[PDB]
Amino acid sequence: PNHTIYINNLNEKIKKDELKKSLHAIFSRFGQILDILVSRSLKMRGQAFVIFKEVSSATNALRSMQGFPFYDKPMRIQYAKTDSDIIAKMW
Incomplete structure (x- = not known):
């Protein structure tokens, strides 16, 4: 558990x-x-x-919104760990 959640499987057609x-x-x-x-x-x-x-907010966000269909796609949520190299491991 961490302050920050990392979301993927977001609809890539949506502007920042x-x-x-x-x-x-x-x-x-x-x-x-x-x-x-x-x-x-x-x-x-x-x-x-x-x-x-707060960490409690991030935990409740992750559990409640796991798989939530957003722009027609189920979001995948995990905790962001500091120094986990999400970007450096990603291609």
Whole structure:
């Protein structure tokens, strides 16, 4: 368990700004969000990071929204571990 959730299987047709705003719309109820990180760098498409202020908020977000159909795609959620090299391992 960690402050930050890592989301993938996001609909890649969605623009960065709208994707962040729609992510706030469904995740804000879990607790205070410090930021949402979205990259349109090709290998980082389809993915997002939601940084909660509290770990309890991130845990409830991950369990409640696992598989949630969003832009017609079920999102996959995991905890982001610091220094896990998500980007460096990704191709």
